[PDB]
């Protein structure tokens with residue numbers, strides 16, 4: 001079907017500009033209104049504006065007009081978006097979305113609705129440079145426990161305990177754009193107290209741009 | 221009415237830039253004299269000579285002015301004075317120049333050109349109007365993978381416009 005393989009997420013100095021791509025695949029790059037939408041990472045959704053590649057009709061934003069630039073380059077069959085003045089309140093996920101059509105295809109009458117979509121990447125600006133954090137045994141019938149992946153750069157990390165052997169009862173918590181220029185994260189599970197010295201709970205973290213994946217003891 | 225019937229079809233392109241030079245309204249509205257008084261007479265006279273002759277002329281004009289409306293109905297052209305068709309200019313053997321026809325030839329000389337094959341064209345037109353076009357429209361309410369994406373005929377479908 002219609003596939004919109006958006007380009008990846010990005011980190012960049014604030015106050016500069018940004019470009020993103022959305023390479024379509026299937027259907028038609030032209031003759032159908034490709035568009036662009038926002039959602040702040042936790043908020044609802046938000047439409048910005050689009051482009052129609054056969055006639056370069058640009059229908060821009062009520063507020064972001066003058067700072068947004070959408071193009072359409074059918075000769076290599078892509079579609080770019082250029083925003084400016086990167087800032088912590090330009091931080092949103094930016095999904096690229098195409099209008100659908102009636103019937104199972106990509107050629108008939110369009111519907112007016114954002115039917116086929118893309119994977120989306122969170123367009124979040126970067127303040128600092130990379131940082132490998134440290135992981136801790138957070139000490140508490142039922143002993144609570146955590147592995148605080150705190151004050152790192154950049155997002156995200158994941159947490160799996162005993163290389164994912166313990167799989168049920170997991171409770172992760174999302175990463176925070178906190179007030180230190182870094183990012184923190186929390187993750188807990190539910191174990192009993194009597195199995196402290198028998199089963200050693202060893203969380204595993206995955207921070208891929210900082211390259212720290214350590215096995216870490218929890219024996220409180 | 222008929223005001224440029226002797227002109228060439230380029231100067232009778234002038235005729236069909238106006239109401240085919242008023243031909244159709246002169247067809248149906250020249251009835252208005254026998255429409256104004258078949259009834260203003262209040263006289264006995266005990267018999268009628270025009271009671272068959274005028275009536276035969278009247279219903280002759282009506283059936284002649286309905287056969288053409290039905291024939292425009294049968295080629296999907298009902299209402300439209302000038303409409304186009306899916307029938308191509310076929311192997312029909314009066315193949316000639318565009319700038320000869322619509323610049324220097326009258327409508328009457330044009331009728332003398334294609335006096336043959338006119339019933340061939342009339343039989344030919346409804347074929348492309350109906351036998352596939354109506355059946356394609358009957359298809360066009362339900363289809364499989366092909367309607368959105370058949371990826372074969374579409375190039376030829378574009379090719380029909382192409383060649």
Ligand SMILES: *[C@@H]1O[C@H](CO)[C@@H](O)[C@H](O)[C@H]1NC(C)=O
Nearest residue numbers: 223224225226227228231232
């Ligand atoms: C008759 O034909 C001549 C061409 O020599 C043209 O100039 C003239 O306008 C025509 N008359 C009418 C009434 O169309």
Ligand SMILES: *[C@@H]1O[C@H](CO)[C@@H](O)[C@H](O)[C@H]1NC(C)=O
Nearest residue numbers: 316317318319320321323324
């Ligand atoms: C069409 O006919 C005109 C004469 O009416 C002539 O001047 C012109 O060259 C012809 N064009 C072609 C392509 O034969």
Ligand SMILES: *[C@@H]1O[C@H](CO)[C@@H](O)[C@H](O)[C@H]1NC(C)=O
Nearest residue numbers: 227228320321323324325326
């Ligand atoms: C063009 O029209 C004039 C008068 O209408 C005629 O004398 C002449 O022969 C015509 N020429 C051609 C090539 O039809």
Ligand SMILES: *[C@@H]1O[C@H](CO)[C@@H](O)[C@H](O)[C@H]1NC(C)=O
Nearest residue numbers: 314331332333334335336337
């Ligand atoms: C057109 O049909 C008539 C029949 O009356 C015939 O005599 C004539 O040869 C045909 N062909 C023409 C005029 O080219």
